[PDB]
Amino acid sequence: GEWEIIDIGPFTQNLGKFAVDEENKIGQYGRLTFNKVIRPCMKKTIYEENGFREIKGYEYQLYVYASDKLFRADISEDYKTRGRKLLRFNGPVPPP
Numbered sequence: 001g002e003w004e005i006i007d008i009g010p011f012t013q014n015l016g017k018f019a020v021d022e023e024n025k026i027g028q029y030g031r032l033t034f035n036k037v038i039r040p041c042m043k044k045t046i047y048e049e050n051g052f053r054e055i056k057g058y059e060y061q062l063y064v065y066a067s068d069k070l071f072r073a074d075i076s077e078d079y080k081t082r083g084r085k086l087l088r089f090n091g092p093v094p095p096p
Helices: 012-027
Strands: 003-008 032-048 055-066 069-078 084-090
Touching: 012 032, 012 055, 012 069, 012 084
Parallel strands: none
Antiparallel strands: 003 032, 032 055, 055 069, 069 084
């Protein structure tokens, strides 16, 4: 697909908060308090198989501090309705 780096403004911090809220519903990790998203944040644009430059959706790979520990979260966002889903949430991981 196509990859780019995006910064850590409010849109990106809100993806982080989305990921921690979603993960807290599962309850496999102890309760997590969102702290902040840090660099780098990667954004992948996924295109329809057929067609020319038709966007299907995006995926965002984040480094997120929650309860003072660092995790990696992947989030999908559908292009048509902009609905979001947490794909994975792992860690703690080493700082980048």
